[PDB]
Amino acid sequence: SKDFLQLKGTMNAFYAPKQRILSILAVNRLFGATETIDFHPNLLVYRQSSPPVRLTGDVYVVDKNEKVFLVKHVFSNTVPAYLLIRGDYESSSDLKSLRDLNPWVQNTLLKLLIPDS
Amino acid sequence: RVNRCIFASIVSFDACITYKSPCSPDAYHDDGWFICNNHLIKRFKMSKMVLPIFDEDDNQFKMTIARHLVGNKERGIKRILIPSATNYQDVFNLNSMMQAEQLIFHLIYNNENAVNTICDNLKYTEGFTSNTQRVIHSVYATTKSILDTTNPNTFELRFFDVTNARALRGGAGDQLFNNYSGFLQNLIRRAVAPEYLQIDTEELRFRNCATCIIDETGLVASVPDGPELYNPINRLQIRNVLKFEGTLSGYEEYPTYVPLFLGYQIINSENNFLR
Amino acid sequence: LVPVGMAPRQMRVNRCIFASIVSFDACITYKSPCSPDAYHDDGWFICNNHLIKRFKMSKMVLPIFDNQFKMTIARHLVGNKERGIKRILIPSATNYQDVFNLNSMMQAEQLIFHLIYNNENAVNTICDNLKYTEGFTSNTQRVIHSVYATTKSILDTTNPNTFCSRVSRDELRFFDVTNARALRGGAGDQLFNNYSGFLQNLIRRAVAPEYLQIDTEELRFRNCATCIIDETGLVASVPDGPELYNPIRSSDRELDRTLSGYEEYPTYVPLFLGYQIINSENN
Amino acid sequence: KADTRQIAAVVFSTLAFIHNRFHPLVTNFTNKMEFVVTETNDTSIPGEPILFTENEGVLLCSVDRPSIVKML
Ligand SMILES: [Zn+2]
C-alpha cells in the first residue's frame, strides 16, 4: 500500500514514514512495489524517553551500543512480522538471540544491517 | 583529632604502590566505634546508623546500630558479616589486600602466626631494614594500641544469642562473642542492637524478630528462618542529552533497610543513665 | 566521528607484559615501573626493568658478521656468592610459583605469571576469586579482562611463531652444554621443550649459543658455557666448577695515571650455551 | 534533521570548549541549557545562525540547522 515503501534488496521488508517504522514480514513476501527506498541509518530514528520504554513479547538485541532491537509483532489482522526499532527501550522479559529467528528474516536483516562496503 | 580509622593506618611500604586511604571522616569522632564508616562498609558490609530510644525533652538515649549491606540472594561467605577467627582468613581475600591490612586483620583475630609470617616475608623487601621495618613497627603499634583500648581487661548484661525462639537449644553465640577479641566484641556491641531493652524491670521491644544471626561461622546477615529480607541499594554522553523539556510524591519514605537487630540488654536498678 | 569506520590505527605499543600490572583496587592508584626499552619493536617482550627485577637478567647486543648483524643477548646480574634458589635465572613451570613470591606481589602480576607459565588452574582460581572479590562488576571485572586480553594477545602473537620455529628446518637451536662430555648439561633441549612457547622465545632472545654455524661458516663465541638449564629452569651456574665472579659495579693514583683513556674489558657475564644452526642469513 | 539530539550535543560541546578556552578552569556550563533547531527562514535570523534567549528561567540556544548545512 501507499502507507509504506519496500526496502531495496528485500522481498519482505518495508518502511512506513508517517509511522517511522521498519517492518519485516515473518513468512510473507511483498508484492506490487513499483518503488523502493534504500536503507539508511536515519530511518531508525532514535526514540527519546526519560524512562526506557517498556516492551513485551519477543525482543532481540541488534546493537546494544545503538539501542537497536527487533520486536516480534503481529498485525491485528494476524500478520506475523518483526519491527526494527532504535531508541531508549527496555524489555519486560529476557532478551533473545537472533539465531532463534528464521533464515528468511535473518537474511533480510543481514542485507539491511551489514554495510555493503 | 585522634584518627581512629583502623585500616587507614596502612602504609604502602612498596615504593611503586601508593595507598590513597580514601576513608570516612567520622574516624575523628570520639565515639564507641574504633573503625569509621567507610572501613566498616568496605570490610564488613555495614553502614553506621543511630537508633533514638528516648527523645522527648532532654532524655536522648540514641543507641547506635549498623545496617546490612547484604542483599537477599547472598549466602554463606557472601552473607557472613564478621567471620570467626576460624574462617575470617577464608571470608576475606587477604591475598588480594595489602600486607599491612592483612597484618591488621591477623592482629584483630589474634593470628600471631600469620603476623610472624608476614613480617618474615617483609624481611626480604629491598628496602626492608630502611623503611619496611619502620612501617611494620608503626602499623603494629597502632593496631596493638587500638586492640588494648578496646579490650576491657587491659590496664554489661548484653546477650546476643539470647533472643532466638524456635532454636533447639544451646545459644553459644555469646560463647563465640566471648571468644572474639575485645575490638571485635566492642564492634559487635556498637553495631548490633539488642531486640529487647530491659531497664529496672521495664522491657522495651524494638523488633518482633531479630534480624542478625550468630553462629560458629561468625556474624551473618541471615534470618532466623524463612527467606532473606529484601535489602536493595560526569563525562557528557550522547545518552546524557535529555529529550524535549516536558506517584506518592507527597509522602515520606520508610527506609528499606535491615538494621542489625539482635539480642537482649538487661539493665539493673540503674535509672536512665545519661552521662 | 573523525576516524574512518574501524580502520585499525597504527602506533607504537608497549611490549613488556608487566606493563599491564594495575591495582585491582580501583581506589588505590598504582603505576608500574617500565624501562623505555619496552617501546622498541624487537624480540624482547619484557622491559629492562622487569627483566632485572624478576629474572636477574640484563639485555645486551652481540655484533655478528661483512654486514654487521646484531644478535640479541642477555647477561647475568647474579653475584658470585648467590646460592641455591638465588641461582635460578629463569624458574621452570614446576618452580616459578616458589621462586616468584606470588604472595608478596600483586594479584595482576600473579595472573600474568600463571598465564606465561601455562597454569590454567591458577588462572581460573584467580579469575573466580576476583569474580567473588570486591566490586568485580563495576570496573574490576573490566580491568581484569583487559589485563588478561593483553597477556593473551602477546602470547598468541608469540606461540605460533615459536611452534613454527620449533618445527623449522632452516633454523635450529639446541640449548644444552655443547661439551657433551659434561654432566651439568643434561637434556637441556627437553627442558626447553617443557617451557612454554613464550618462555621459549624469551630463552632464545636471551641465551646466545656457544657456537653458531651459518651455512658453512662456524663462529665460536665461547670455549665454555656461562649458564645451564635443569629442571629448576635457567640456572646462572658454571657447569664445570667455581662460579664466575660478577662484580656488579653499578645498579643495585698511579694506577689511573697509567690507566687514563684506555680500552677496558667489561666484567659482565653474557649468556652463552648450546648450539645454533642456520641456512642463509634470514636477516 | 531528525536526530536533534546529536545536533544539540555537538553545539553544546563546541560552546563549552570555547568557554573553557576562555576560562580554562571551567569544565562544565553550570545552568542547564535548552536547545531548539529552527527549520525556516521566517524562524532564522540572518548573520547569527546560533543565538540565545532565556525563557525567564533558563537559557535556550537557537540553531539554524539549514544554514549550518549550507555553510558546511
Ligand atoms: Zn616495562
CB pair distance less than 8 Å for B17 and C27: no
Q: Which residues of D touch A15 (CB under 8 A)?
A: none
Instruction: Name the 3-class secondary structure at A66.
Output: coil
Give B-chain residues touching C28 at CB under 8 angstroms. Answer: 12, 17-20
The rounded Å distance from CA C15 to ligand 1 centre is 7
Plot region of B218 (φ>0 → left; ψ -120 to 50 → alpha; else → beta): left
Q: How far apart are CA B143 and CA B83, in angstroms?
A: 19
**Cell 545562525 appears where?**
D49
Cβ–Cβ under 8 Å, residues C178 and C227: no
Q: Which C residues in the span 8-67 are in contact with B, Cβ-Cβ below 8 Å?
A: 23-25, 27-33
Q: Which of residues 29-48 of D touch B (CB under 8 A)?
A: 34
Instruction: Judge residue B117's burial from the number of C-beta atoms within 10 Å of its C-beta, 0-12 exposed, 13-18 middle, 19 or more buried.
Output: middle
Contact B236 D9 (CB under 8 A): yes
- Is residue A6 within a helix (H) or strand (E), and if so which, with residue range? strand A5-7
* Angle, in degrees to the nearest 10, between helices B182-191 and B133-150: 60
In this complex, do C24 and B121 lie within 8 Å of one another by their Cβ atoms? no
Residue B145 CB partners (closer than 8 Å, separation 6+): none
Where is D12: in which H helix or E strand?
helix D4-22
The experimental method is cryo-EM
Residue A88's SS3 state is coil
- Interface check for A50 against chain D (CB to CB < 8 A): the answer is no
Residues ≥6 apart with Cβ < 8 Å to D64: D38, D44, D45, D49, D50
Distant-in-sequence, close-in-space partners of C142: CB < 8 Å, separation ≥ 6: none
- The DSSP line for A19-40 is TTEEEEESS------S-EE---
Q: How far is the CA of C16 from the centre of ligand 1 (A)?
A: 5
B106, with CB counted inside 10 A (0-12, 13-18, 19+), is: buried
* B227 in contact with chain C, both atoms CB, cutoff 8 A: no
Yes or no, beta carbons of A48 and D5 under 8 Å apart: yes
CA distance to partner chain B, nearest, from residue A60 (Å): 21
- Asked whether the beta carbons of residue C28 and residue B16 sit closer than 8 angstroms, the reply is no
Q: Report how far ligand 1's centroid is from the alpha carbon of B252 (Å).
A: 56
- Main-chain phi, psi angles of D56, to 5 degrees: 75, -5
Q: What residues in B contact C27, CB-CB < 8 Å?
A: 20, 22
Residue of B nearest to D6 (CA): B238
Q: Do A45 and D2 touch (CB under 8 A)?
A: yes
Q: Cα A19 vs. chain centroid, distance in angstroms?
A: 12
DSSP string, chain C: --SPSS----------GGGG---SSTTS-B-----GGGGS-SS--S-HHHIIIII-EEEEEEEE----EEEEEEEE---SS--GGGGEEEE-TTTHHHHTTTTTS-HHHHHHHHHHTT-HHHHHHHHHHHHTSSSIIIIIHHHHHHHHHHHHHHHHHHHHHHHHHHH-SSSEEE-S-S-SS-SSS-SHHHHHHHS-HHHHHHHHHHPBPSEEEETTEEEES-SS-S-EEETTEEE---SSSSPPP----S---HHHHHTSS--------B-B-SEEEESS---
Residue of C1, C24, C27, C125 to mutate when probing chain B, most B C-beta within 10 A: C27
Q: Which of residues 82-111 of A touch D (CB under 8 A)?
A: none
Residue of B nearest to D16 (CA): B236
Query: Which residue of D9, D13, D34 is in closest CB contact with B245?
Result: D34
Strand partners, A69: A61, A85
Q: Which of residues 2-31 of D touch A (CB under 8 A)?
A: 2-3, 5
User: Are C56 and C85 contacting, i.e. CB atoms less than 8 angstroms apart?
Assistant: no
Maximum distance among all Cα pairs of chain D, rounded to whole angstroms: 39
Residue B246 to chain D, least CA–CA distance (Å): 12
Residue in B closest to C102 by C-alpha? B95
Interface test with B, best of C104, C109, C143 (most B CBs within 10 A): C104
